[PDB]
Design a protein around this ligand. Sequence first.
Ligand SMILES: [K+]
Ligand SMILES: [K+]
Ligand SMILES: [Mg+2]
Ligand SMILES: [Mg+2]
Ligand SMILES: [Mg+2]
Ligand SMILES: [Mg+2]
Ligand SMILES: [Mg+2]
Ligand SMILES: [Mg+2]
Ligand SMILES: [Mg+2]
Ligand SMILES: [Mg+2]
Ligand SMILES: [Mg+2]
Ligand SMILES: [Mg+2]
Lengths: 740, 740
Amino acid sequence: GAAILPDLGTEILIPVCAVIGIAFALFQWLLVSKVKLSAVDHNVVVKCAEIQNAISEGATSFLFTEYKYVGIFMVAFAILIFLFLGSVEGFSTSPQACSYDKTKTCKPALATAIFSTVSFLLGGVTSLVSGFLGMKIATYANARTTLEARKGVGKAFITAFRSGAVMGFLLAANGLLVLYIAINLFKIYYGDDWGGLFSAITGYGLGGSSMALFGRVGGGIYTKAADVGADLVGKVERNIPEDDPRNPAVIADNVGDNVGDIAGMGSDLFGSYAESSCAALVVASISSFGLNHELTAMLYPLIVSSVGILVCLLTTLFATDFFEIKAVKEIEPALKKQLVISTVLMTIGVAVVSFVALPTSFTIFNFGVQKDVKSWQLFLCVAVGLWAGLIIGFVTEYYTSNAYSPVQDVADSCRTGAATNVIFGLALGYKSVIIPIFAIAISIFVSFTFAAMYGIAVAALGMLSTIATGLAIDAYGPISDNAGGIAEMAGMSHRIRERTDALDAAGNTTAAIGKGFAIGSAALVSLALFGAFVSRASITTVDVLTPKVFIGLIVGAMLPYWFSAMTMKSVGSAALKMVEEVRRQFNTIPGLMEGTAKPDYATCVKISTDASIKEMIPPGALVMLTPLVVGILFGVETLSGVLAGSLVSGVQIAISASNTGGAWDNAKKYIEAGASEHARSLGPKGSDCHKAAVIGDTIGDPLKDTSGPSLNILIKLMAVESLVFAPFFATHGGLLFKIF
Amino acid sequence: GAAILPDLGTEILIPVCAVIGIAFALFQWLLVSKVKLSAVDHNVVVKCAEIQNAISEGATSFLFTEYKYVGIFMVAFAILIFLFLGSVEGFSTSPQACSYDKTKTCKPALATAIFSTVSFLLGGVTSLVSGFLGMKIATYANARTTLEARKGVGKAFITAFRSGAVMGFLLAANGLLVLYIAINLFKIYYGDDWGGLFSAITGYGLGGSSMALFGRVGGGIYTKAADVGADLVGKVERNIPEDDPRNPAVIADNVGDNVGDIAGMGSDLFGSYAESSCAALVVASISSFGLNHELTAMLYPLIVSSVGILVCLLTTLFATDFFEIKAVKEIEPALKKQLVISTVLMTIGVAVVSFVALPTSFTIFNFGVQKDVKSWQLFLCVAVGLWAGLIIGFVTEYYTSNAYSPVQDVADSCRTGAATNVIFGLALGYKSVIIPIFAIAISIFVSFTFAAMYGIAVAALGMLSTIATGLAIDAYGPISDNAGGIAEMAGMSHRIRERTDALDAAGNTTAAIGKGFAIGSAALVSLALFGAFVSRASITTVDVLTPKVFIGLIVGAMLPYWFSAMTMKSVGSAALKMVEEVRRQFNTIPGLMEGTAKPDYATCVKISTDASIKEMIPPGALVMLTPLVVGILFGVETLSGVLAGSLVSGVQIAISASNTGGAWDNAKKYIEAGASEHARSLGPKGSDCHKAAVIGDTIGDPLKDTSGPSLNILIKLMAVESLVFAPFFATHGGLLFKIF
Ligand SMILES: [K+]
Ligand SMILES: [K+]
Ligand SMILES: [Mg+2]
Ligand SMILES: [Mg+2]
Ligand SMILES: [Mg+2]
Ligand SMILES: [Mg+2]
Ligand SMILES: [Mg+2]
Ligand SMILES: [Mg+2]
Ligand SMILES: [Mg+2]
Ligand SMILES: [Mg+2]
Ligand SMILES: [Mg+2]
Ligand SMILES: [Mg+2]
């Protein structure tokens, strides 16, 4: 049956909401443009502008290099998709019978081979745009945040958070609008073949996360090579302030925050958004909505996201206008209130959407059978994901913010040296997985029971329904990070750096929270896609206790470690190179230490450019090739094992790495700020305790910024890729078992 | 039908081989006893004896205290076993139809509740005895190895390997003799009910690992708190040598080697042997061997172990009599040759056993169906496991010896400080998992295919078929470790410490290898036990894509991390206390640093005794309570997920933790030896590079000696524990799904 909301209404609502989100982003960017500066005190304003330009040049320069390689890889890979999907039916142009209804005829498999290539390119391009737009706002807002900090934390908070919101609303609205357009264009061809339409559309998320993979790892090695190098020689060895302009690695470091923590993260969360929508859509496409051609219900996920944009617009206003921060201890709770407000409002929003966009009863495909499902049960599916998110954010804050005992004990353990700092930091991360896993598990059980793979997918989307706010609170952080870097490079008052340091500590926590959301929604969407892959591969049963599934399971569980071995070694090796270079400059450039000679920033930009562009290739290949190699050699049953294994295993290492890194960073921040008797007694800056904290912080650097966060991409990427190639693996795969 | 070897012959063979092994172990003890020393140069000899006595009292004192608690828990848990298994058939005394053959009549389930409790205590007791005996020989041989070091590497090597072999042959022969005795005693009651017999016998492994769990964690906490504290204050802060008699934590440290690395490890591997034998037995008891009451073939696992002892005896002779070590570079090669010789001899040994102790055709239970299997296939099952082991050994040496580039690169990375040393160490560990996992997967495929759970179990036994040599090369390590500590504490010459340092570094590699076999065999025996649990709980299929199974899977995967969090945080905190204590004495005891006054060793023994006894409980609780809680509250479907997930996840963190810790240690020894130019380039002792290596080494201490090697126990324990309580879970479990 049709829903309360008409098909034509849905067709208007979605693009109108995207347009509202884009408008909001422009308006915010407009307000941020009010903070004036130019490279033509007035001294401090000119210096901030010059530093900003150095950073912006470097960041724009690296992405162009990275995106050139990735773009090339994207074109090659898109050719594989066309070939492999095309070969399933020998590239025939003959229409065949609908796999979901033998009484109807569908468009040739060749059409979907073509349109999967088209949507894959759409997603990859949108993914690149998402990250590039993010970089362009961050590299614009960084120094405006610095200048605003002269007036106080609240003013600087506002411009950093407004700017983060610029990225969030652009990314969420652009991602929605592109998806909506692609669906409508594809529909012109598919007509009534909604199964094929939406099966082709799943390339969008494959493209999204494919580009995201290289974006996260490439940017990740770039930034961390610089970070670790700058910090160890500057802070640990030569006893100078963090981000000192004498330090040759500082420009690369701050460019790094934009290239990794911003551009990479943007592409990454886009991949999340794209895959979840696409996952909800394919399952619906052969459920009652798709079979009965009911557009409003079919596009329920896009209606959920449309309303999410609106709810986040409102929520944003609380931190942007209705409240002002006057004290440092108000920052993290401000950020947290963004989560709390958006969740409570979105819960209402989703109730409304579920009331008017869904018929009260319908069926969801469930491994061959149409399962009876009620609209209130579907509301619980998206709401359990939405709430799992918040729980995850709360626990993550507790484990990464220096307002709480876990991180303060990590800082306190520095009193006995770096070895105890690291033992405590590792244990913290390990311990932190427990409640998010329980939350994920509860999410899976409810959504699975109520509505199978559709329910689970709509739970992932629910966790990502407030993505504009999520990106805002997250993008806020590297912008605040640069702001302090520019503050120090511009020789500003110590009072400025203290303010930026407060903002930056909050960003460390907010970044950990963002990783929590990525890993959570990744676990959810990957399960859904895995389930869909099983049907699409004509697997009757994924039975753990078969040789083929089990060998897949144990090898799948090892992939996240193989992947982490590569990325850790890359950072370690580039970092070592970076230390040698920074030492060489301090040791042989007359007056560098004196501050009467300028350092060579370009060489450090070069060390991390060379390492990242080269070393992003093997882990990208590990992830992308695995489904193809396992699928073609071992078959769909073994790929099944591999999907379940890498999901349940990858999730643990992802969470503990991101949180351990976060903890070390904020433990260091706590010693740096000395804002309590306990903190002061670990100080001052330069003390053996501080240096021990720096050691932990830098070990945590690759953990939380290269390997850890990329892991959620490994997991979600292999799942879409597997679903997309499913018919090709089913038909032409499992060779090793066929020759024998 | 039946085999070449008559049941009488089997009944004679098995204890004969055990007694030979016990005999051999005693013989080697005599030879070692030829090295003379007494407490109440010969003055150095008296010192060595005074120190040995301190260590001996310490180790004995702790084991008695630890065993007191474990033994109590052992009694309590046995009460649960009886109660729960008893409660299935309502404690009836009447016979019932065989669980495996409705047509036949079987002994009452209550008999089985009783015999399971007997075999449990039998196993719990033999586990403690395995550990205590190891501790006795180690704490005897250590100062004897020290003294023989006055005559060169080769001499001290022999008395160290001989002494290790005493532990290996005693534990191997004793575990076998007790199991044999128990099967025969149990058979008196059971008669023709072999199902119930070997189903009762499986408690033996449950007992072994249960008691091993507390010994590994208990000892592991005791030893690493001392080790971290001693090394940090002594080496990094006070610039004194490792094991310096001024350092109040040195006696606790050297006691620790015996209490953890020997006693816990002995119990640990006893559990492995026991579970693997029992797992092979339970599947066999409902296969053609057990149905047709063919005793020889039924005891094929025990016949393999029997020949295993003989093979190992022969093998030991190559290291003890046939060859002599002249150069330190010969140590590791001698140890590795022990693995190669035994693997080759045992391959022939198993061929022979398969040819005489098996019918050419038989059937193996296979999820409800008799599966036709040929004896040349059972041969391949044990062999794949035997060779996977060797492979694992070769790979583990590659990533943990300082004679190869992985460890050498890690040491090299110390030039840029502790942060890069730790980053490289983490990466090496992650990297190391790949080939062992492949080894494990290949074994699983081959063994699963040929003979289902029986093959998998027989592949676990194959990997442990040379357990005597394994324990030998491994127990050699901590003996050498103590020997260097006694050298330093007795103030012997640098030439002496240098010789033990070389033995010790080899011991480091040898210990990582032991961990390999533990993790490898644990994966196999757990998968087998998992499969038996599935049948025993009347599960039709373990479907990954069901709400019940998947929440099990993801949660199960989280548990190894939860366990690692507890055990790392415990060492971290105890170590923090230890450091403060050592500093206290150095700072407030006059003439202590100068060597005029005695340190109080007892305060450090107390910190670590207090920490371990207290902090071993929650991890034990987590592992023991988990099957009960999930089985009772959630049901056998979910417990199935928990078993699969903790297996595939646990193994990754177990291999990487042990190998990372192993690497940091040997990188440190590498610098301390200075036996190459590269090595010397990072020295001398006390350099910034050495200190950064010590940082990595002490971070590695809790990874490789507390959490890491205990994880193999976590996995294998939950597997047998689930199998034993399966009828109880199937009948009275799944409460949450029953009430709602
Ligand atoms: K940050
Ligand atoms: K050792
Ligand atoms: Mg930094
Ligand atoms: Mg940064
Ligand atoms: Mg920074
Ligand atoms: Mg930070
Ligand atoms: Mg950092
Ligand atoms: Mg030590
Ligand atoms: Mg030791
Ligand atoms: Mg030692
Ligand atoms: Mg060692
Ligand atoms: Mg140690």
